[PDB]
Each structure stands twice: as C-alpha cells, then as structure tokens.
Design a protein around this ligand. Structure first.
Ligand SMILES: CCCCCCCCCCCCCCCCCC(=O)OC[C@H](COP(=O)([O-])OCC(O)COP(=O)([O-])OC[C@@H](COC(=O)CCCCCCCCCCCCCCCCC)OC(=O)CCCCCCCCCCCCCCCCC)OC(=O)CCCCCCCCCCCCCCCCC
Ligand SMILES: Nc1nc2c(ncn2[C@H]2C[C@H](O)[C@@H](COP(=O)(O)OP(=O)(O)OP(=O)(O)O)O2)c(=O)[nH]1
Lengths: 114, 368, 151, 188, 118
C-alpha cells in the first residue's frame, strides 16, 4: 500500500538519518551554554542524558516524512534555546518536575482510585 | 545606463575632460581641478566577459557604442612583442637563447606543456592589470564610463584551469597567487559585469567557426579544459564579484541582440545600493568627500608606476620562471639593440625621430 | 527561452545543488499506512489508555426528525468526574472527554484513527431498515385482526 | 538559615570564617527541605506512621569544614582570588561579641541569622541514632547536596556581574563525605 | 513633465514612451516562444498590441493615460515590468498543459461529513 508524495526535506532514510545526527550534534554542543545562561537546577550530565532519553522516545519511527517533521520541530526548539527566547520555566518543562510519579502497579492504582 | 534613446542624444559631459594623456594630475593639480564635477549616471565600469570565443569583442563594441562608453580592446601579447615604432620583436628570436624565445597564444595552443607557459600566464595578468588601470584614469578624468572585455579579476581562472590540466606546476601556481595577492587589492572593482554563458558543447562548435589556424589544429581546447573554465567562472569569479558588482547572465548576447541588452541594463538601478554606507555592493566607488575622489584619481593618474612596481616579488626556488644569468646578458644584448629599443619611445633617431637636440619632453605614465 | 537575463541563483548554482533541488521536487514513494502520534503532540499517556468509539449519534427517541444522525462520529472514553469541593460543580481532568469529530463513513473514521495512533472500535452500523408496507385500507378489514377499534 | 547563615556578611570577618575547631570536629547530615516536607505529608496520608519517631537526615555525612569549603568554591569565593580563610572560632573572641551585640541591638530578628543560640547549633555534630526509622521508611527519596546546593548558591555567587565567557570559571570539585570508620578516627 | 508622481517612492519617468515600447517589445518576444494554442499567448499577444500601439500613437503622456486609462504612465511601466517576470517565469511552468493533479474524491465537497447513499 504505497503512494507517491512530495518529500519534506530529505529523499532517503540515510539522508534523514544524517540530518537527525546533526541535530544531536548541535544540541550536544549547546548544553554547556544552556546551563550557564538559565537559572535551572540541572547540570550538563543530567541534561546530556535528557537529550539521549528523548531521542530514544522516537525509537520505532520509520516514515522519512515523519522523521523530517521531528527534525523540523527538533531544530525549531534549538534555535529558540540557542536564543533565550525560551524562558527559565520552559527549559525545565522538559523534565516534568512538578508532576510527581503515578504508581503503575494495579494494587496501588486501585487503592489510590482512578 | 542612460542609452542614447533615453537621453535622446549623445552624452553631454558635465565639464571638459581633463587631458589625462598629456598632463599629470598630482596633489597640486588637484587643488584647482576637482573630480566629482564630471561624474554622470554613465560614469561606470563594465566588464563584458565570457568563455573562449563567445563573441565578446563584437558585443562590447556595439554595447559601448550605445551607452557612449569607451571601449578597451582585449590585451594580447602583441602589446609586448610589438614596440611603438611597429617593429616585430619576435623576428629577433633566432638569436635569443631557447629559454628567452618569444611565446604567444599560438605557441600555447601548439606546445602548451612548454615551461614558458607559466611566464605567458603571468604576462596576461600583468597586461590586464595595466590596461585596467588605464580605464580607471579615463573614467576618473573624463567621467565617461568604460567597457572592458576581461578584467584582471577574472584572469586567475585561466591560470587555475591550466593548472588542473597539469600544464603548470605547483610552484608556478604558488607564484601567481602571490603576485595577484600583492597587486589585486589596489584596484577598484567594476560597477557592472556581464557574462555570456555559452554551454560547453556550443563553444567547441563555435571555436571551429572562427577557423583560426592554430586553434583548430590545437589540442588544448578539450572538453576537460573548456569545462574547467566554466566551473571556474561561475563558482569562483562570478560568485565573488557579485558581492560588489551587478551581474547579468545571458546565454550568448554575441549571438543575440545588444539593443535588448542595453534596455536590460538601464532597468538595473544603481542608487538603491547607495543608501547604506557600508553596503558591500559598489563599496569601492563610495567616496564621502571630495578629497576621497581626488585621492583615488591621484593614485591611478599619478601613482600608477607604483601600482606596476608591486609585481616585483622575488621567487627563485621556482625553476621555470627563473631566467639564467648567462641568458639574461645575451637577451639584454639582443632585446635592447633592436630598432627602436635603443632609447625611450620617441627618441630613437635611427627610426626617423628628429629634433632630438631641442627635444626635452617625455610622456606621462610612459615607460622608462 | 528569451534573451532576458538568467536567474543568478540557478545560473550560478553548482551541479550538486541543482541535483538535490531536483530530487526535492522528488515525488518519492512512501507507504500509505503511517502513524502521526509523534508529531501530533498528544501526551503519550493518553494515546496508550484511551479508546475511541466510532459510532453514529443516537436518534432522539422524543422526536421524528433524523437529519442529525446523518454522520459518523468519534467520542473518547467516559473518564471520571467528581463533585467540586467548593461550589459542587462537576469537575474533571479529562481534556479529550470533551471531544467530538464528524465523518462521512467508518472507513474514513478508521483511517483518521489509525493516522493518529488512537485505539478504536466501531459500533455496528445500523442495518438499513427493512421495508414496511404501512397500508391505510387495512385499518378497516372484514375478517382480519388489523381492524382498528378506535379512530 | 543554614546556606544563608554561612553566606552572609555578618558571619565573616572581612573575608574569613571563624569555625569551631575549623569545623573539622563537626559532622552533619543536612536534608533538603522539600524531602522533609514530603516526609510530613507522606506521614499524614498513612496511619501506620502514627505514634512513632522519625529521623529526617540526608543520605551523606560531611564534616563542617568540608561543606563550607565547597560552598565558597561554588560561590566563586576561592582563597586564591577572593581571600577566603578559616580561623578557629576559639582563637578570636571578636566573633562572639558580634553575636552578643547583634542579639541585643536588633528588636525584631537577628541580622544574618547570627546570635549565640545559632552558634551552638553549628558546633554540635549530628547524632543519628541507630534503629529509629528514617524518611526512607516513609518512601521519600532523599536529594543529595550536590544535586541542589549548586543551584541554591547561584544568587550568592561573587563577581556575579562579570558575564564570564564559557569555561572562564571551572566547575568546583565536589565535597568528600566522611566514611563511618573515618568518623571513629576523626573523633579518636 | 509631471512635477510629482503623487505616490511616495515612485519617481517621475523620463521618456516613458521609450521604456514602455521596449517592455512591450520584450513581452511579445517572450510570449512568442509559447505554443500557439496556449490561451495565455493569445490574450497577451492581443492585449500588448492594444497597449503598444497607443504608446506609439500618442506623444503626450497625459493623452496617453486617457487613451489607455489604467493609471499613470509610471504605473503603466510598473505593470509592464511584471508581465516580463510572469511571461518569463511561465515559460518554465508550462501551464498550458493538462491538469497536473487530478482532484481527489470529495476534496471540494461542502458541507462535509455526510453519508452518501449509493
Ligand atoms: C544596621 C543593620 C542593617 C541591616 C540591613 O541592612 O538589613 C539588610 C541586610 C539583610 O538583612 P536580613 O538578612 O534580611 O535580616 C533581616 C533583619 O531581621 C531585619 O530586621 P527586622 O526583621 O527585625 O526588622 C526591623 C529592622 C529595622 O529596625 C527597626 O525596626 C527599628 C528601627 C526604627 C527606625 O531591623 C533592622 O533592619 C536592623 C537595624 C537595627 C538597627 C537599630 C539601631 C538603632 C539606632 C538607629 C535608629 O543586611 C545585611 O546584609 C548587612 C547589614 C549588617 C550591617
Ligand atoms: N592561457 C590563456 N589564454 C587566454 C587568456 N585569455 C584569453 N586567452 C586565449 C584563449 C584562446 O586561445 C583565445 C581566445 O581568445 P578570446 O576568447 O579572447 O576571443 P577574442 O577576444 O579574440 O574575440 P571574441 O571573444 O570572439 O569576442 O585567447 C588567458 O588568460 N590565459
């Protein structure tokens, strides 16, 4: 079940793989600047893990066009973070610190209620 | 910019052109004669370039006629091997040692691999350089713009193309860059550059149309060589000059009409770039005060000898360009005892000049 | 073309850039079964827990009009609500519970649900009503029981 | 009144830090306030925790000398440039006068949290009993000082007007906790 | 000569008769390259003649504007500078060909999302 479509940025998965890695470069280069220029608790090693953790979220993605869009949005945040348009609050938004853990085991959820 | 139809008639100079061929323009001349008073909309510099055998000369002459522009014929080695009196220096080559034998375009097309090729390429750069400066003197002293076929800026393409084919060595290319770096920075970049993009196959056909003896018989104009020039004009030259000069590209105005081209030029506006002071486009020709105008005029009108003395860059580790001492003595004997080379031009009595007893004058921006 | 100058950008562009300018015009093939969950921006938690019910909205028994059941719809699961402690309003932390979209056929509805990663299940489409005679004369019948005792 | 009581101007003597025994005989287990608050609430949601004693201590033990050195590294107040140095509080009697004067003069609250009662808190080393439940029994996951303190002291940093280029300030070395055996030797 | 164009940033034109004549001349050459059956070629070729002749027919710009209407001579030039760009650009798109993309089913249906009974 295939159709003809217009490419977004890349023509091949290999080019898409190439673009995604560059986005990892630029972020990985940028973490030392973000720590200095934002009054946030997190350190470089913690952040450099968060970069790894989330690039892993989109582990099973296959469509090149979807990978292009993730890289378009992924790049947009970096420019908004290479610049300090994103404020102190927004950067820490990547951690969901305020939300406390919700237990997963059935017995705990049942006792806690829906 | 304003063709004859736009003005409805011939160019009307703002003030009488300064006789720059006969009177010098030093500091003390600049006090009474100012430069800016002569500049019009047509006081600009135009470089009509292209690939080999693209009919640039024909297009330039017609173009320079419409815009009332001065036309400067492309330099050739006849300017070095023919003295003022007309004698052909090449006739003296049987006497000269082999290394000092005359070398021309004919020779390049016939024995391109000869070590004198590196010499030949530097001469072309030097010739264009002197001619280019002469155009600036005409512009600054007369106010009439000039049309050039190939500026010295575009000359490194031929040297680079020749290098890729292996005619030149590493050393010769290294020497050429140092000369260009040592000298190129002192010129004023052209206002406008026009390019005639003939595709590679077309120029190969076109060359055979001239039916010049040596060119058709030659092997230099290969697909590889002619292809190299195309890659060099567009990727290195045109991409660089466009940062300063307006750029128009045509498939072939030589095969096309020029009246359409002149009407294309006049559409281009040259004032929108004037607004911002530091705008790169046409930066060189942006003089705030009248002093800056005169300084540039003095430099090219009065300090050209300095400009042509920067070509003295000593490089002897290169063996091709070095001329052996024994040859130099022999070459000096033959070269400077030829008819008309005994003395500066206009003084060789044996060539018919007369009145030398009462003659004391020498030309300005003249040799020797 | 015609004499008029050539575009500097394309005229001066290196052959490599023109080539990628071509395949970016492209028309490449891609499979038509795609999942847009990563880019849709829904929180991952909702996508895993909440089912979507493709259904035709139920006709209002208290009316005879029908043109309000001429669509297929999607409505999410009916998550929890609770009394508001202060004023007693109904409260909920269920953004998608408010949701409703219309479609022309279940095939489109399934197609939309797959493209967004939702888990779905379709209510059985109501079979087209069997033909009904509804004759008037039978209300006054000679030996049949259909005869009406009222009027 | 712990990370500010050591960063305040009053606590110092022009650049110095009078610490009891230079702080080398004091061992502490500071706990982040949020972890303590989590403990209070968790104890509130559970009835099993009623009628019992809980000790709220951090995960690591540090000598008071070791901590204060680490702060002044985080605060960029290093001895090499800033001029930080540690007295022994017993040697200088000027300091005790400051507290005694400070307590008397101020009507509302001591300035810089400095007053003789607070001094005695500093001197005494934490004595976490064995066998009494800790917050880990209540499910709290304690935050280490290294996680939190470097962000607490960002607004107390010295030469904070600099606009340093990246790397012009080197990351400070972490503090060295005190092993259980070492505490035996440290206290003879 | 008009003292002022009346529009900010639009300069009075010298020899508008020449500038228009060149532009209309250029357009007819660009249009000529297009296939004869192209409807765009038939219209501009018809149109530009109606504008071109009026430019030569009249020698007084005020009379020219009345003869053509459609704004001041300066704007007439501004218009003419466009169809060069359009005509030149359109020799690349080749719009006269058949419909590039057949419309999808229901892609222009309003109101949306109704059951269609076969
Ligand atoms: C003089 C001390 C200056 C204190 C100061 O500058 O505070 C800011 C600043 C920070 O103070 P802080 O940490 O916020 O402490 C709050 C105090 O509790 C702030 O004091 P408070 O919370 O008790 O509120 C009352 C406040 C103001 O004092 C009063 O209420 C009484 C003044 C009546 C007028 O007290 C003071 O500020 C201390 C001043 C007492 C001086 C009394 C001298 C009496 C003769 C002058 C009359 O002090 C310094 O960092 C260095 C100043 C030390 C010298
Ligand atoms: N090695 C070398 N040859 C050059 C250079 N410049 C021009 N030529 C040679 C290449 C050809 O053998 C020959 C082509 O002459 P042109 O292209 O200048 O044609 P020409 O100006 O005579 O008239 P046209 O171009 O047709 O209008 O001169 C240069 O810089 N280096």
């Amino acid at each position: 079940a295939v159709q003809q479509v217009r490419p977004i940025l890349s023509v091949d998965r290999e080019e898409a793989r190439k673009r995604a890695l560059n986005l990892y470069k630029a972020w990985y280069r940028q973490i030392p600047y973000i720590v200095m220029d934002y009054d946030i608790p997190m350190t470089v090693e913690q952040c450099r893990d968060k970069l790894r953790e989330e690039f892993v979220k989109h582990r099973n993605v296959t469509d090149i066009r979807v990978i292009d869009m993730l890289v378009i949005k992924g790049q947009m945040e970096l420019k908004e973070s290479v610049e300090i348009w994103k404020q102190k609050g927004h950067i820490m938004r990547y951690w969901k610190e305020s939300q406390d853990p919700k237990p997963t085991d059935f017995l705990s959820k049942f006792i806690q209620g829906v | 910019i304003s063709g004859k139809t736009m003005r409805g008639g011939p160019r009307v100079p703002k003030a009488a052109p300064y006789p720059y061929k006969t009177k010098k323009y030093s500091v003390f001349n600049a006090i009474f004669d100012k430069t800016s008073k002569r500049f019009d909309e047509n006081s600009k510099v135009i470089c009509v370039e292209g690939p080999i055998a693209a009919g640039k000369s024909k297009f330039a002459k017609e173009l320079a006629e419409e815009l009332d522009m001065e036309y400067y014929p492309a330099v050739d080695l006849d300017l070095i091997y023919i003295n003022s009196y007309g004698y052909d220096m090449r006739k003296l080559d049987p006497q000269l040692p082999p290394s000092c034998r005359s070398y021309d375009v004919r020779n390049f097309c016939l024995d391109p691999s000869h070590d004198l090729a590196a010499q030949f390429q530097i001469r072309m750069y030097m010739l264009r350089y002197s001619q280019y400066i002469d155009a600036l003197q005409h512009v600054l002293s007369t106010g009439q713009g000039v049309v050039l076929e190939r500026s010295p800026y575009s000359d490194f393409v031929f040297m680079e193309a020749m290098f890729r084919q292996g005619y030149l060595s590493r050393g010769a290319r290294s020497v050429y860059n140092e000369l260009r770096q040592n000298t190129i920075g002192e010129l004023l970049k052209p206002h406008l550059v026009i390019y005639l993009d003939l595709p590679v196959d077309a120029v190969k056909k076109q060359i055979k149309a001239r039916n010049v003896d040596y060119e058709v018989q030659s092997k230099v104009f290969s697909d590889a060589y002619l292809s190299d020039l195309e890659q060099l004009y567009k990727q290195q030259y045109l991409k660089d000059i466009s940062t300063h000069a307006e750029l128009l590209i045509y498939d072939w105005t030589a095969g096309g009409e020029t009246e359409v081209v002149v009407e294309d030029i006049e559409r281009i506006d040259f004032n929108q770039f004037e607004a911002d002071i530091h705008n790169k486009k046409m930066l060189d020709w942006r003089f705030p005060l009248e002093a800056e105008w005169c300084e540039a005029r003095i430099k090219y009108c009065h300090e050209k000898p300095d400009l042509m003395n920067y070509f003295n860059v000593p490089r002897f580790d290169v063996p091709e360009l070095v001329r052996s001492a024994d040859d130099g003595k022999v070459w000096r004997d033959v070269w400077f005892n030829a008819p008309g080379m005994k003395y500066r031009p206009g003084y060789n009595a044996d060539m018919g000049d007369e009145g030398l007893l009462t003659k004391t004058k020498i030309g300005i921006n003249q040799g020797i | 073309t015609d004499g008029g100058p050539l575009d500097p950008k394309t005229a001066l562009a290196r052959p490599e850039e023109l080539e990628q300018r071509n395949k970016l015009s492209g028309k490449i093939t891609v499979p038509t079964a795609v999942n847009l969950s990563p880019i849709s921006g829904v929180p991952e938690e909702h996508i895993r827990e909440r089912r979507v019910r493709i259904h035709i909205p139920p006709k209002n028994a208290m009316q005879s009009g029908t043109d309000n059941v001429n669509t297929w719809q999607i409505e999410f699961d009916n998550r929890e609500r609770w009394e508001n402690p202060l004023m007693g309003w109904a409260s909920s932390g269920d953004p998608l519970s408010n949701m409703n979209v219309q479609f022309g056929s279940p095939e489109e509805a399934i197609t939309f649900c797959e493209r967004n990663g939702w888990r779905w299940y379709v209510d059985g489409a109501a079979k087209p009503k069997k033909e009904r005679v509804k004759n008037y004369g039978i209300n006054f019948a000679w030996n049949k029981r259909t005869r009406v005792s009222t009027k | 009144r712990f990370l500010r009581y050591y960063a305040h101007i009053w606590r110092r003597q022009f650049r110095s830090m009078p610490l009891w025994h230079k702080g080398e005989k004091t061992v502490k287990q500071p706990v982040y306030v949020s972890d303590v608050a989590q403990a209070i609430i968790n104890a509130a949601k559970d009835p099993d925790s009623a009628g019992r004693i809980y000790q709220a201590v951090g995960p690591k033990r540090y000598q008071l000398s070791e901590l204060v050195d680490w702060f002044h590294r985080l605060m960029r107040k290093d001895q090499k440039r800033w001029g930080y140095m540690r007295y022994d509080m017993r040697w200088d009697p000027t300091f005790l006068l400051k507290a005694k004067l400070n307590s008397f003069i101020c009507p509302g609250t001591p300035i810089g949290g400095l007053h003789p009662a607070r001094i005695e808190r500093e001197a005494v080393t934490d004595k976490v009993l064995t066998g009494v439940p800790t917050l880990e029994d209540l499910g709290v996951t304690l935050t280490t000082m290294e996680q939190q303190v470097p962000w607490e002291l960002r607004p107390y940093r010295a030469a904070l007007y600099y606009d340093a280029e990246l790397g012009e300030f080197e990351t400070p070395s972490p503090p060295k906790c005190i092993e259980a055996r070492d505490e035996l030797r440290l206290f003879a | 000569i008009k003292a002022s164009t009346g529009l900010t940033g639009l300069a009075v034109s010298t020899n508008p008769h020449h500038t228009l004549s060149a532009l209309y001349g250029k357009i007819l050459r660009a249009v000529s390259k297009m296939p004869q059956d192209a409807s765009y070629r038939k219209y501009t070729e018809q149109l530009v003649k109606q504008r071109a002749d009026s430019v030569a027919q009249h020698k007084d710009i005020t009379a020219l504007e009345k003869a053509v209407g459609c704004g001041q001579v300066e704007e007439l030039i501004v218009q003419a500078e466009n169809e060069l760009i359009l005509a030149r650009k359109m020799l690349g798109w080749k719009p006269w060909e058949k419909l590039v993309q057949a419309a999808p089913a229901k892609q222009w249906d309003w109101p949306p999302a109704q059951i269609m009974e076969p």
